Design a protein around this ligand. Structure first.
Ligand SMILES: [Mg+2]
Ligand SMILES: [Mg+2]
Ligand SMILES: [Mg+2]
Ligand SMILES: [Mg+2]
Ligand SMILES: [Mg+2]
Ligand SMILES: [Mg+2]
Ligand SMILES: [Mg+2]
Ligand SMILES: [Mg+2]
Ligand SMILES: [Mg+2]
Ligand SMILES: [Mg+2]
Ligand SMILES: [Mg+2]
Ligand SMILES: [Mg+2]
Ligand SMILES: [Mg+2]
Ligand SMILES: [Mg+2]
Ligand SMILES: [Mg+2]
Ligand SMILES: [Mg+2]
Ligand SMILES: [Mg+2]
Ligand SMILES: [Mg+2]
Ligand SMILES: [Mg+2]
Ligand SMILES: [Mg+2]
Ligand SMILES: [Mg+2]
Ligand SMILES: [Mg+2]
Ligand SMILES: [Mg+2]
Ligand SMILES: [Mg+2]
Ligand SMILES: [Mg+2]
Ligand SMILES: [Mg+2]
Ligand SMILES: [Mg+2]
Ligand SMILES: [Mg+2]
Ligand SMILES: [Mg+2]
Ligand SMILES: [Mg+2]
Ligand SMILES: [Mg+2]
Ligand SMILES: [Mg+2]
Ligand SMILES: [Mg+2]
Ligand SMILES: [Mg+2]
Ligand SMILES: [Mg+2]
Ligand SMILES: [Mg+2]
Ligand SMILES: [Mg+2]
Ligand SMILES: [Mg+2]
Ligand SMILES: [Mg+2]
Ligand SMILES: [Mg+2]
Ligand SMILES: [Mg+2]
Ligand SMILES: [Mg+2]
Ligand SMILES: [Mg+2]
Ligand SMILES: [Mg+2]
Ligand SMILES: [Mg+2]
Ligand SMILES: [Mg+2]
Ligand SMILES: [Mg+2]
Ligand SMILES: [Mg+2]
Ligand SMILES: [Mg+2]
Ligand SMILES: [Mg+2]
Ligand SMILES: [Mg+2]
Ligand SMILES: [Mg+2]
Ligand SMILES: [Mg+2]
Ligand SMILES: [Mg+2]
Ligand SMILES: [Mg+2]
Ligand SMILES: [Mg+2]
Ligand SMILES: [Mg+2]
Ligand SMILES: [Mg+2]
Ligand SMILES: [Mg+2]
Ligand SMILES: [Mg+2]
Ligand SMILES: [Mg+2]
Ligand SMILES: [Mg+2]
Ligand SMILES: [Mg+2]
Ligand SMILES: [Mg+2]
Ligand SMILES: [Mg+2]
Ligand SMILES: [Mg+2]
Ligand SMILES: [Mg+2]
Ligand SMILES: [Mg+2]
Ligand SMILES: [Mg+2]
Ligand SMILES: [Mg+2]
Ligand SMILES: [Mg+2]
Ligand SMILES: [Mg+2]
Ligand SMILES: [Mg+2]
Ligand SMILES: [Mg+2]
Ligand SMILES: [Mg+2]
Ligand SMILES: [Mg+2]
Ligand SMILES: [Mg+2]
Ligand SMILES: [Mg+2]
Ligand SMILES: [Mg+2]
Ligand SMILES: [Mg+2]
Ligand SMILES: [Mg+2]
Ligand SMILES: [Mg+2]
Ligand SMILES: [Mg+2]
Ligand SMILES: [Mg+2]
Ligand SMILES: [Mg+2]
Ligand SMILES: [Mg+2]
Ligand SMILES: [Mg+2]
Ligand SMILES: [Mg+2]
Ligand SMILES: [Mg+2]
Ligand SMILES: [Mg+2]
Ligand SMILES: [Mg+2]
Ligand SMILES: [Mg+2]
Ligand SMILES: [Mg+2]
Lengths: 103, 44, 77, 94, 61
RNA sequence: GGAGUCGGCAAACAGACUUUGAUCCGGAGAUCUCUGAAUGGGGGAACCCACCUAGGAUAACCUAGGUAUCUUGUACUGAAUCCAUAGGUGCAAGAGGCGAACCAGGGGAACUGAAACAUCUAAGUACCCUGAGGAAAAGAAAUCAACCGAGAUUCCCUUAGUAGUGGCGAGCGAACGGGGAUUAGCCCUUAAGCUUCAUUGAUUUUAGCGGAACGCUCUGGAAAGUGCGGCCAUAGUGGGUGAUAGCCCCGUACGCGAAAGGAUCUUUGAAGUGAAAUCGAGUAGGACGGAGCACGAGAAACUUUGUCUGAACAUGGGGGGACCAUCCUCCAAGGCUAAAUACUACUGACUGACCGAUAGUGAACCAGUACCGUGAGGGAAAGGCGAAAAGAACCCCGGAG
RNA sequence: AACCCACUCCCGUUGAAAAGGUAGGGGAUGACUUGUGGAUCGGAGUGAAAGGCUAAUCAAGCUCGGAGAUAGCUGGUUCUC
RNA sequence: AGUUGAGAAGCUUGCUGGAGGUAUCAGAAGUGCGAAUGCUGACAUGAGUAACGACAAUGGGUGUGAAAAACACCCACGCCGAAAGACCAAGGGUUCCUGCGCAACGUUAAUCGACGCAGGGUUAGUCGGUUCCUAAGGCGAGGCUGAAAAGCGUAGUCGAU
């Protein structure tokens, strides 16, 4: 089971945005994630009149590696690793420091 | 000047064709020796 | 081919040695002829390509018994 | 012919400027059909589905154009065509 | 069209179920030829429906 | 299982799929065009033309089955010819083709060496052909030894480059006897064993599950790196994350897991086989021509056979390197038998004082491809932006270059 | 004349062409010329016979194997004192 | 670039480069290249030289175009006409037509093209095949022969020219 899921609450560790918070938007393959509000780029695309039209300069996020973010423990307010807890009938993700469920 | 290769598809299929190699065991080993090299053509 | 029906003898190979001891390949062939044998329990002649040594066996063991051996081993004479 | 084959013989109308001229001046329609469709099958299928009275069908086989690319020489699919002649006045609408 | 719902019928009214899809598969190809098709996914979906009916139609014996 | 997905080059634009469980992974099942042993008949492979039966239409057909040859058994029938033999039909079961090496046979070179060359060597090699199996073959003394004894076959080390053999030239080359790997014998007054089912249990295999421990500071685009202090260990020289990570991620040590298929070892019921009937006759021995034995006719014993002959019956027969006498030791002309042994086209795991794009496979890339040849056949070149496309909006010269 | 052939000169020889061209030349109802399909081949085929031809290769084709044949013969053999 | 040794060589630094290197002493070599008419790529000299492929032959006007000796049209010249015209077979396989193009191909330029891209185009009871029949020849149930592969051949069934 994935430790970092979609629509999570994470925090950036390592990278230029080290210390920012956001929510996971897209979980790309080959271990890359799109986290809202971090790693912003500007893309310049020719608005050629051929084949309709196109945009100019755009702002959008750029995927960063999956090992550069961690779950935010919003009780101690710091990055924590996670584990998988014994099942009543199903696995649940829990924090390593406090052994408490994450949602 | 007349050159050596004067094409014809009927005389091509009756000498080098698939059904001409499968008639004799000496031509059946040409096919096996070509299926082992990995050829894509394998027959004229 | 040149194989005795009742004994299975077939051609073999060997050498010719000249006085200077030159060796060349050769073959030894069985001495086999066609011959009709009277079969009493069938009232007709049966023709076989048997060797001369195969006739000595037929004379000794009989012909009805020899034909039985050929029948068992799938010989169509 | 089994009713399963009835729907598997016609593939669609053929769109061209020559087909549009025939559909007006001679009441003749051009279709794309299966490569193993005989003239008898096409005649029965057009009447069965479209509810018309076809009078004659001709047929021709079209080769696949061969195109050149950096990785070799690829070619398209051979297909079949049929000119279907209807009665003097009626439309082969869908 | 789940195969569970398909086993609730009989061969007599499954064969008309297969004929109903042949209309639908044909009509969608007539629209595609003229270019006035908007529901492009329906081509690949109808193909799967016929294959499933023919699957169950083989299990009755 | 647990949330994304509609394979890649290869990106884009639409249509969609779903926590009422998708894509994905494993077991089983269904469908499985045409050609190819190709098998209804032909044929220039991927094409052409049919027949019979059952069912369905009414027009110019549809659906499902079958129809090659040969071998074996069986039922019917029936030529010269009276009877029956050959033959002709219909049924059942089996074979056919492919595959790198290994195995047992059939046929079988030459270059070369001898500083020439014939006998000899290379060599029973290369090559061609035929069968079988996961192994094959050989196997239970008509064997050796030497008057003391051993005890089926197969493989390894010695004996030993020794005794022999050889235009006694170049060369070829044992055995006896020792040390080991393996352990096993049983039948023709019918056995061990081997198959195929039906059972009694166990173990593996085809997917997966959990899996411990790091904070602060400096340089820097980015910290894993500097400095300071901790924690985990049956897990510390694994891979990669924006530079060098036991504690960031995937893993690792270590424990768990199979609706259902495959395999193995297991007890006991059955059927079949072993299987040749009754201890071995055209057999042992002999003459001529060959082959094999380390042994090339040599004092040349022994095995085998193309031609021709040809015994005795346990007070009998074979062998002990010409031959004879005496002693010793075995019982041929009927069979079955595991392990130790050979190989790897194929799959998995780990490793390397192996290569790092003229190297390593011919081939890191859409390579047995492009290209060359009528064909068999021959056979290339060609890797790297950046951490992330953020791959250069907009203006000017220029042919809307 | 067409068609088949190739006696002379010159050009061309890195050619327009790995055997031609322009001028003349021989046969042109025959032992003639030609299309299509078929048969014979490597110590073998075929030859009105030149050892000629058998896919631009012939006093023994091409291809892959024995094979890295053999070479008392040429050539080459890499840093320092 | 400077410097140190008798030599193969060593060391210290400036610039480029952007992630790996290996002191000392031992251990293994695919361990040192100017030659082999050596092998593979790249690049020189000849040299801006020979040649631009039948010596039927071209001259103006207009148009398009960034740009016309070569493109399209018009007037006027030349050449073939038992072909240098038209049509079948073999062989080839989209070279056919239209719209948009000029990087490369065209022995020069190109607005043109048998060139690039994308669409379109081949309609049969009588034409040519297939189905029917056979020639040379091929294969060939049984059969005869042959170490094995296999050879020949009967019934038969393929094979047009
Ligand atoms: Mg021929
Ligand atoms: Mg070719
Ligand atoms: Mg010899
Ligand atoms: Mg037609
Ligand atoms: Mg295709
Ligand atoms: Mg078939
Ligand atoms: Mg056939
Ligand atoms: Mg057939
Ligand atoms: Mg077989
Ligand atoms: Mg032999
Ligand atoms: Mg020799
Ligand atoms: Mg020597
Ligand atoms: Mg010599
Ligand atoms: Mg010598
Ligand atoms: Mg000599
Ligand atoms: Mg020899
Ligand atoms: Mg087997
Ligand atoms: Mg055995
Ligand atoms: Mg015995
Ligand atoms: Mg022994
Ligand atoms: Mg004793
Ligand atoms: Mg001498
Ligand atoms: Mg896990
Ligand atoms: Mg962990
Ligand atoms: Mg690490
Ligand atoms: Mg950290
Ligand atoms: Mg038996
Ligand atoms: Mg006996
Ligand atoms: Mg005995
Ligand atoms: Mg004897
Ligand atoms: Mg004798
Ligand atoms: Mg002898
Ligand atoms: Mg001898
Ligand atoms: Mg001597
Ligand atoms: Mg004898
Ligand atoms: Mg004896
Ligand atoms: Mg003796
Ligand atoms: Mg045995
Ligand atoms: Mg390479
Ligand atoms: Mg490099
Ligand atoms: Mg290469
Ligand atoms: Mg001519
Ligand atoms: Mg001549
Ligand atoms: Mg002359
Ligand atoms: Mg003159
Ligand atoms: Mg003349
Ligand atoms: Mg002349
Ligand atoms: Mg005259
Ligand atoms: Mg004359
Ligand atoms: Mg003629
Ligand atoms: Mg021949
Ligand atoms: Mg000759
Ligand atoms: Mg020649
Ligand atoms: Mg020769
Ligand atoms: Mg010779
Ligand atoms: Mg050649
Ligand atoms: Mg050649
Ligand atoms: Mg050599
Ligand atoms: Mg050799
Ligand atoms: Mg030298
Ligand atoms: Mg770096
Ligand atoms: Mg590194
Ligand atoms: Mg070192
Ligand atoms: Mg070297
Ligand atoms: Mg050099
Ligand atoms: Mg030198
Ligand atoms: Mg050189
Ligand atoms: Mg030179
Ligand atoms: Mg120059
Ligand atoms: Mg000059
Ligand atoms: Mg000059
Ligand atoms: Mg000049
Ligand atoms: Mg000129
Ligand atoms: Mg010229
Ligand atoms: Mg020209
Ligand atoms: Mg002009
Ligand atoms: Mg002008
Ligand atoms: Mg001109
Ligand atoms: Mg004139
Ligand atoms: Mg054609
Ligand atoms: Mg083209
Ligand atoms: Mg054109
Ligand atoms: Mg144009
Ligand atoms: Mg230009
Ligand atoms: Mg140009
Ligand atoms: Mg074109
Ligand atoms: Mg016919
Ligand atoms: Mg005939
Ligand atoms: Mg024949
Ligand atoms: Mg036969
Ligand atoms: Mg016929
Ligand atoms: Mg015919
Ligand atoms: Mg004809």
């Amino acid at each position: 089971m994935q430790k970092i899921r979609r629509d999570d609450e994470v925090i950036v560790i390592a990278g230029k945005d080290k210390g920012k918070r956001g929510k996971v938007l897209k979980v790309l393959a080959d271990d890359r994630l799109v986290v809202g509000g971090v790693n912003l780029i500007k893309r310049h695309t020719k608005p050629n009149p051929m084949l309709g039209q196109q945009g100019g300069i755009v702002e959008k996020e750029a995927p960063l590696h999956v090992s550069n973010v961690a779950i935010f423990n919003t009780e101690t307010s710091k990055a924590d690793r996670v584990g998988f807890k014994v099942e009543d009938g199903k696995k649940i993700r829990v924090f390593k420091s406090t052994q408490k469920p994450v949602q | 000047m007349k050159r050596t290769f004067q094409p014809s598809t009927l005389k091509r299929a009756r000498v080098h064709g698939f059904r001409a190699r499968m008639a004799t065991k000496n031509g059946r080993q040409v096919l096996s020796r070509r299926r082992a090299k990995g050829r894509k053509r394998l027959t004229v | 081919s040149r194989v005795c029906q009742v004994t299975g003898k077939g051609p073999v190979t060997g050498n010719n040695i000249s006085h200077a001891h030159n060796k060349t390949r050769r073959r030894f062939l069985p001495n086999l002829q066609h011959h009709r044998f009277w079969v009493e329990s069938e009232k007709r002649f049966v023709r076989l390509r048997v060797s001369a040594k195969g006739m000595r066996i037929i004379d000794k063991r009989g012909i009805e018994a020899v034909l039985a051996d050929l029948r068992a081993r799938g010989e169509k004479f | 012919m089994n009713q399963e084959r009835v729907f598997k013989v016609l593939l669609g109308p053929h769109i061209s400027e020559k087909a549009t001229g025939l559909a007006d001046g001679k009441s003749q329609f051009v279709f794309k059909v299966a490569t193993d469709a005989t003239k008898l099958e096409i005649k029965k299928a057009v009447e069965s589905l479209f509810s018309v009275k076809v009078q004659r069908v001709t047929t021709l086989n079209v080769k696949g154009k061969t195109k050149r690319t950096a990785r070799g020489l690829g070619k398209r699919n051979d297909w079949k065509k049929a000119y279907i002649a209807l009665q003097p006045g009626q439309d082969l609408d869908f | 069209m789940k195969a569970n719902e398909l086993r609730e019928k009989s061969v007599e009214q499954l064969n008309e179920q297969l004929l109903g899809l042949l209309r639908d598969q044909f009509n969608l190809r007539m629209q595609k030829a003229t270019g006035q098709l908007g529901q492009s996914h329906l081509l690949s979906q109808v193909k799967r429906d016929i294959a499933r009916v023919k699957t169950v139609l083989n299990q009755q014996a």
